[PDB]
């Protein structure tokens, strides 16, 4: 029950028949029934900051006057 995922490669070795290029993957297998035992996957999501940067009721159009 292996999970195979890709690595985001930073420094690439001089190689494209083994390392740097042809997508380098890594493998994870969970050994425990409790998910709290799992390592962190770090495959995380981002979001728009608007709930903090623009919490105003009427939409902000930046080219327009904020007050109108």
């Amino acid at each position: 029950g292996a999970q195979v995922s890709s690595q985001k490669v930073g420094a690439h070795e001089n190689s494209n028949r083994a390392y740097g290029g042809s997508t380098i993957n890594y493998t994870t297998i969970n050994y425990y029934r409790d998910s709290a035992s799992n390592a962190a996957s770090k495959q995380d999501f981002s979001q728009d900051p608007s709930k903090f940067t623009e919490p105003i009721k009427d939409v902000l159009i930046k080219t327009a006057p904020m007050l109108n």
Binding site: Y31, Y32, R33, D34, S46, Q47, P49, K51, T53, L67
Partner: protein, 235 residues
């Protein structure tokens, strides 16, 4: 047993590791999440929020509400600066304790564009034009409008839209800058000048404050997690 051979690293505890480990409370009945408002997914979301700059850290104003107020007045035009600040967002004392600065002090490197927004808090009857400037490093830091005007700048006309934003575009030799004062990765100079002068009619306060805010743009990032010097525990 399967023949195995231990490699270097065996039995060490690297505090940044990421391994599995046995659960001390197996089959625990975990309470489910509810949808709490305000979830955050990345620390840079907090860096994109405007927070207020303690510009005036004079011996009597520092550590008081007055440190946030930049005082202007209707005095005759001068080419001398209202304020001068270095673009060192994690280490200049005026920027390092803003939300942007305090997050940058948990990282070694920063990169991207920033923006400064100023709010005029004089009366509605007060008018004026100011010049907000960013001079990328390598020359004499601007102390006169003549020099500041040659760099990146916004001329702000005070009026019904109360506030004005100057964007400090990412202009840097290195791909990331250090979050400490460092000449090689120095960022340059922020300054504000009177463009014309503040003018008020009679029966109006002749002195008033502006407040400034800093926040990151959407191209801003940080890296190399590190401890901050902003908290300690003595003994």
């Amino acid at each position: 047993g399967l023949p195995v051979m231990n490699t270097p690293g065996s039995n060490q505890y690297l505090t940044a590791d990421n391994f599995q480990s046995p659960c001390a409370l197996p089959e625990f009945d975990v309470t489910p999440p509810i949808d709490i408002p305000g979830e955050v997914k990345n620390m840079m979301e907090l860096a994109e929020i405007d927070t207020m700059i303690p510009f005036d850290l004079s011996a009597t104003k520092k550590n008081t509400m007055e440190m946030y107020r930049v005082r202007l007045s209707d005095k005759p035009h001068t080419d001398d600066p209202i304020l001068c600040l270095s673009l060192s967002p994690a280490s200049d004392p005026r920027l390092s304790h803003t939300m942007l600065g305090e997050i940058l002090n948990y990282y070694t490197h920063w990169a991207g564009s920033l923006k400064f927004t100023f709010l005029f808090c004089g009366s509605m009857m007060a008018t004026g034009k100011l010049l907000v400037s960013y001079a990328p490093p390598g020359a004499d830091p601007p102390k006169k409008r003549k020099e500041a005007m040659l760099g990146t700048h916004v001329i702000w006309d005070i009026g019904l839209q109360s506030s004005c934003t100057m964007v400090v575009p990412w202009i840097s030799n290195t791909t990331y800058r250090q979050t400490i004062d460092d000449s090689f990765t120095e960022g340059g100079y922020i300054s504000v000048f009177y463009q014309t002068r503040i003018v008020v009619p009679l029966s109006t306060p002749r002195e008033m404050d502006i407040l400034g805010f800093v926040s990151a743009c959407n191209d801003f990032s940080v890296r190399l997690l590190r401890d901050t010097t902003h908290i300690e525990q003595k003994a």
